[PDB]
Amino acid sequence: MKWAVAHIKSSFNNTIITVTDITGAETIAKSSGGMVVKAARDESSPYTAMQMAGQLADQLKDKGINGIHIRVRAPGGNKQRSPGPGAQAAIRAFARAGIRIGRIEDVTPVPHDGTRPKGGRRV
RNA sequence: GGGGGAUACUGCCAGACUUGGAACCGGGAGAGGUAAGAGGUACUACAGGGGUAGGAGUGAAAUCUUGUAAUCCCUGUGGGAC
Ligand SMILES: [Mg+2]
């Protein structure tokens, strides 16, 4: 019974995923949108997220881990705040890969009043 | 310009009257003001540990950034705004 935690940085342009142990100071598997898929336009797709979850599940099985919690985050703060579409797709692809999922937490770093939000309002 | 009559009216004279404003007390309300301090989270700087082919961004791209190990993750120490 080995427990791991997968970090999913889901954006509107990418959904990088890295898998660590409980302490988090050691990583096991990692794969971003462009790590396996060669199109930047399709790096944030749910199909790319399921491909990343599948290609991480076999490495997790090789390392000896069958269950991972999910710590999903958006960029957060002075950028995009809500989680992207790749989070639920990655977690469902992990659950369909055989890897059990327990707790899933949305841990996007939320600022109360952080630095100045870069934006153009209408543009 | 100057005389007589009137006293409502307004201006003059001396009080008063409490409603108008002014002053004080009571339990409450308020992102009211200055002064001081602490705090919240995020960000960021460097350093350390893990890990290894891209991260960022776009309508799509490229500059930019990354093999001097970035992205992501963990630890720690400072930073200024908010
Ligand atoms: Mg403009």
Q: 10 Å Cβ neighbour count for A55?
A: 16
Please name the residue that has the structure tokens 């002075």: A78
Give every CB contact of residue A52 below 8 A, 6+ residues apart in sequence: A15, A17, A31, A32, A33, A35, A36, A90, A93
The C1' atom of B7 and the CA atom of A102 lie apart, in whole Å, by 104
In the 103-122 stretch of chain A, whose C-beta falls under 7 Å of nucleic acid strand B? 109-116
Strand B, nucleotides covered by protein (CB < 7 Å): 40-43, 48-58, 60-62, 71-75, 80-82
Closest alpha carbon to C1' of B51, residue: A27
Phi, psi of A78 (to 5 degrees): -90, 25
Find residue A8's DSSP bridge partners: A17, A72
Give the resolution in Å. Answer: 2.9
Give the method of determination: cryo-EM
